[PDB]
Ligand SMILES: *[C@@H](O)[C@H](CCO)NC(=O)[C@H](CC(C)C)NC(=S)Nc1ccccc1
């Protein structure tokens with residue numbers, strides 16, 4: 001039932017390319033400099049020096065669309081300020097159902113491969129099917145923008161290309177709002193929380209939202225752009241979207257403590273305060289919980305106590321997946 005974005009028809013385009021023995025070349029979002037940007041990603045910018053658009057097949061012998069699931073570890077920001085989109089994609093992967101509504105099953109660099117992929121976005125009160133060819137910006141044989149921790153996996157690179165396409169170029173994605181991407185991925189409605197004015201029931205709100213599969217994001221508001229992406233003393237990033245990926249209570253020295261888990265879409269650079277991966281607090285928790293919850297890995301994902309979280313972060317976004325009609 002999805003609208004064909006720009007009347008481009010995924011199955012017909014793929015059937016024709018296979019028939020004519022060619023690879024799709026997307027005339028609606030060509031491998032050219034207007035698709036990158038005009039300013040920072042302008043043609044005469046040093047950011048775009050040496051960029052060549054390459055298909056994943058031109059990059060290695062065995063490219064894969066999905067390796068071991070479409071999971072949040074597949075989301076590692078490249079040279080673009082699209083943290084807000086990426087945080088929203090990492091959150092999306094927590095619920096398999098809505099994930100694969102955005103990223104339809106069956107997509108491959110083998111069976112049915114004609115250099116064309118497709119994704120479904122919610123735009124102006126309807127689901128739309130957006131195609132892209134798989135020419136991607138690379139420099140020295142490496143992806144410039146989003147990439148997966150798994151070097152041969154391409155679904156997230158292609159999803160971000162499709163989202164850049166609906167916005168006109170990659171550069172349109174620099175600076176934005178996690179909610180917008182949450183809504184584009186879901187049809188949901190977003191409610192936001194000022195963490196310095198949190199309702200006394202906010203942790204319960206978080207628990208229930210994550211149970212129901214809603215998308216959660218958080219950030220440290222900046223009011224001065226010299227603070228954009230500043231790293232804090234405890235290794236948070238300012239003006240930067242994180243994904244909220246879990247909320248669990250632990251038994252710490254016999255006491256119950258509210259923890260919250262989040263993920264920097266960079267795929268690295270984590271909190272170093274209490275509850276961090278190598279933090280001391282973990283030694284004092286139930287060993288079933290420690291083994292269940294704590295992973296010692298530089299992967300961008302970490303825990304904080306809810307107490308520290310509502311001190312350090314300033315904004316929480318919750319996207320509800322089943323909104324009321326109006
Ligand atoms: C994350 O990589 C980027 C870096 C910008 O170059 N940060 C943003 O896009 C932030 C993300 C928020 C704080 C969650 N948003 C910005 S800079 N501005 C903005 C624009 C539109 C709506 C809200 C916020």
Ligand SMILES: [Ca+2]
Nearest residue numbers: 067068069074
């Ligand atoms: Ca994967």
Ligand SMILES: [Ca+2]
Nearest residue numbers: 297299300301
């Ligand atoms: Ca970690």
